[PDB]
Amino acid sequence: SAPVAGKDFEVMKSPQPVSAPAGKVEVIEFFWYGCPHCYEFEPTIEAWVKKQGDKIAFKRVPVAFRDDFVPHSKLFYALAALGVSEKVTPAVFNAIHKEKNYLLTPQAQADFLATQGVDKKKFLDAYNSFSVQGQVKQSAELLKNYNIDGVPTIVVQGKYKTGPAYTNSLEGTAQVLDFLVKQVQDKKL
């Protein structure tokens, strides 16, 4: 059955500006390294994004629901600043969820990433950079702008939100996302 508006996805009363160009559908994944659903969803969203390719503009935004997890948002943007996000991120998820290493401090992050081939000094310089600080503050602003209260949350074209909170299953989130993107492409949404 086709997804329904209000149950399987939410039409934001205040849509946000989309960064994707014309011809591409913007897809934003609000996630948290420590959220088990986000870890469980990673392979699904990765494959789906790669399959879509030039049809979408995918980005992730880290979420720090409490102050304790701001270091995870700094980690996200620090890995991006170093250009090693795609490579070491699976090890980051594994460290948090399977090795009981929650990577909650810059030092623990640096040590672990050192075991993954990342120079401690370069990573810490990125972690404490003003640019990463600004990106983290911006990610909090976006959490507010999109009215995100849970993760993982998928936002399509800055207007339609979905996720396991709406679909009760990660597969359901994927199916709704694919539907939403295709609806936007056909100009039906």
Numbering used by the authors: 9 to 197
Sentences from the paper on this structure:
Disulfide-bond-forming protein A (DsbA) catalyzes the formation of the disulfide bonds necessary for the activity and stability of multiple substrate proteins, including many virulence factors. DsbA works in tandem with its membrane-embedded partner protein DsbB, which is required to maintain DsbA in its active, oxidized state. B. pseudomallei is a Gram-negative bacterium that is found predominantly in tropical areas and is the causative agent of the deadly disease melioidosis. Binding was characterized using NMR and X-ray crystallo­graphy. Both 1 and 2 bind to a transient (or ‘cryptic’) pocket on BpsDsbA located adjacent to the redox active site which is not observed in the apo BpsDsbA structure.
Oxidized BpsDsbA was co-crystallized with 2 in a crystallization solution that typically generated crystals of the apoprotein, that is 200 mM Li2SO4, 100 mM HEPES pH 7.5, 29.5% PEG 3350. A crystal was harvested and diffracted to a resolution of 2.3 Å with space group P21 and unit-cell parameters a = 69.4, b = 59.4 , c = 105.4 Å, α = γ = 90, β = 104.9°. As such they were modelled as alternative conformations of the same molecule (with occupancies of 0.43 and 0.31). Similarly, we modelled Arg74 of chain B (Arg74-B) with two conformations which differ depending on the presence or absence of fragment 2 in orientation B (binding near the Tyr110 side chain of chain B). The two orientations A and B of fragment 2 sit in an almost completely closed pocket at the interface of protein chains A and B.
